[PDB]
Design a protein around this ligand. Structure first.
Ligand SMILES: *[C@@H]1O[C@H](CO)[C@@H](O[C@@H]2O[C@H](CO)[C@@H](O[C@@H]3O[C@H](CO[C@H]4O[C@H](CO)[C@@H](O)[C@H](O)[C@@H]4O)[C@@H](O)[C@H](O[C@H]4O[C@H](CO)[C@@H](O)[C@H](O)[C@@H]4O)[C@@H]3O)[C@H](O)[C@H]2NC(C)=O)[C@H](O)[C@H]1NC(C)=O
Ligand SMILES: *[C@@H]1O[C@H](CO)[C@@H](O[C@@H]2O[C@H](CO)[C@@H](O[C@@H]3O[C@H](CO[C@H]4O[C@H](CO)[C@@H](O)[C@H](O)[C@@H]4O)[C@@H](O)[C@H](O[C@H]4O[C@H](CO)[C@@H](O)[C@H](O)[C@@H]4O)[C@@H]3O)[C@H](O)[C@H]2NC(C)=O)[C@H](O)[C@H]1NC(C)=O
Ligand SMILES: CC(=O)Nc1nnc(S(N)(=O)=O)s1
Ligand SMILES: CC(=O)Nc1nnc(S(N)(=O)=O)s1
Ligand SMILES: [Zn+2]
Ligand SMILES: [Zn+2]
Lengths: 252, 257
């Protein structure tokens, strides 16, 4: 089974991991193309009630929250998706762990909300297909104030410390885990950041970040156990070259 | 319902009965207002390779009653951008009648004499039926045909064969030709937006790329195109285009400032 920082080589696990257009990438704001056609993102049905509960799992490469049907998202007019799950990427003590970087800067952590195009019934049908999968990514930065939205997830990590364990958590407002402005973001086409690394994924990276306390960031990157009786840390992929791709910005 | 595959221009069955998608909110064609198009510097020049076909093998040219369609062979590769590849499947035309333009798309309300469409299939899909309705599954390149003083050599290869397939359902084999010669000169100037097929099933998720520059045909050639073929029933195959559809919020992008 694949892992971070070691065999098996990802290209052996999946040929697509050696594709020419992979993710994540380094975003250089000055080189991003202002595209007036990029409208504000629309997310409805993300304010979930206390029940039913949601599955939170330590799968060895991240902590993943399974999302229910009904979380509708649109990248634009007639381009709709539904959220499937969200997970995080982080570093370690004294080391940032976001996947994407901005002007070479790596942030403490990054959250990914994976969506499936309504044109596909299942994920296996969308893999590798243009726009079949769309991921919303936001950077998590260190701040003086503790984040209430993230407290709902971070306080449950200890319950699933051991690799492969899972637990049910109360419903929460998923949209509260995201930045304040849905009209400011970068967008480009790439791939999944972990095997099978299928291409054709539409990546949308919020320009605004969300803040977590130093303590919360410590809890996120030093609680779960990964493969090989070792703390699950630095679970992010190195940035990949744009190789000609042009990143678009929804703002001038 | 019975005979679900049947449809025509200018009359029953209502397209929504043929295919529900024909009543979708985001259809094609649309009216293009250059002033309101969003300049998107990420739109690079179109790439078309393998379009210069040799004399043999021959290609099938058919009057399907809705248009004259040329079946393209494997090998015509096209890219809308890096890593966004397609292969051409076929090309067809939309035209008007005596003293009446018939293009599908319009620019600032202006309708051109005719329009050519080169339909492509994303390399991520093995078959068309899997691409239908999927985002970017199908991509169509569209160019306007205008009236000019000179006879167009490229189009002569198609127009001179229409008499052999005047009746709906007729077909003939024609010599290989340079498909790219049927297109405009600048592949870097175009408009692009997402819509649907302009005929049933009217599946959405189609990426439309409309060249900013046009190609010219003589008045005689345009007359040959609109006055030689016969359509469904006993009517002349003319005015085979769909009315303009509202953008409904969609923003057309332009590859040039
Ligand atoms: C959200 O989106 C915003 C908006 O695009 C991003 O903010 C911009 O980020 C870029 C990149 O980080 C900033 O660009 C930098 O600008 C500096 C200018 O500062 C002074 O220096 C020049 C003189 O050189 C004066 O003209 C100017 O008035 C200022 O006084 C440059 O110094 C930087 O370049 C230097 O460093 C880089 C390497 O780091 C080298 O490649 C260069 O050669 C050079 O040495 C750089 O160009 C830009 O200022 C920001 N704009 C705004 C409005 O804030 C956010 O980063 C983005 N955030 C997220 C999370 O996505
Ligand atoms: C390929 O791409 C090019 C580049 O965009 C297109 O060319 C442009 O086409 C648009 C639309 O046809 C043209 O826009 C029109 O400009 C006129 C300006 O001309 C004079 O008038 C104004 C007075 O207001 C003066 O300031 C100016 O200096 C000029 O002297 C406007 O008059 C037009 O607006 C009016 O008419 C239309 C009806 O046609 C109404 O809908 C409007 O409400 C308004 O009343 C209009 O804005 C533009 O000039 C063209 N640019 C260039 C460089 O040629 C091609 O059409 C396109 N071709 C294809 C096949 O895609
Ligand atoms: C089907 C599915 O969700 N798999 C993913 N694998 N990697 C992903 S990531 N890090 O690119 O968001 S999503
Ligand atoms: C399968 C196929 O190619 N069907 C088409 N139907 N309409 C088309 S058009 N006029 O929008 O190019 S292509
Ligand atoms: Zn991820
Ligand atoms: Zn057509």
């Amino acid at each position: 089974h694949w892992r971070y920082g070691g065999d098996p080589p990802w290209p052996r696990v999946s040929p697509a991991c050696a594709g020419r257009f992979q993710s994540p990438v380094d975003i250089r704001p000055q080189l991003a193309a202002f595209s007036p056609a990029l409208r504000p993102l629309e997310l409805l049905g993300f304010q979930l009630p206390p029940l039913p509960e949601l599955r939170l799992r330590n799968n060895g490469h991240s902590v993943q929250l399974t999302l229910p049907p009904g979380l509708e998202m649109a990248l634009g007019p007639g381009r709709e998706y539904r959220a499937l799950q969200l997970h995080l990427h982080w570093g370690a003590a004294g080391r940032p762990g976001s996947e994407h970087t901005v002007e070479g800067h790596r942030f403490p952590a990054e959250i990914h909300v994976v969506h499936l195009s309504t044109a596909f019934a299942r994920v296996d049908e969308a893999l590798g297909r243009p726009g079949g999968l769309a991921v919303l990514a936001a950077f998590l930065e260190e701040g003086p104030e503790e984040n209430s939205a993230y407290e709902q997830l971070l306080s449950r990590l200890e319950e699933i410390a051991e690799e492969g364990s899972e637990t049910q958590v109360p419903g929460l407002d998923i949209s509260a885990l995201l930045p304040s402005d849905f009209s400011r973001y970068f967008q480009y086409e790439g791939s999944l950041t972990t095997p099978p690394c299928a291409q054709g994924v539409i990546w949308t990276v919020f320009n605004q970040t969300v803040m977590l306390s130093a303590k919360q960031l410590h809890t996120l990157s030093d609680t779960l156990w990964g493969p090989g009786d070792s703390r699950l840390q630095l679970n992010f992929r190195a940035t990949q070259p744009l190789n000609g791709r042009v990143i678009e910005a929804s703002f001038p």
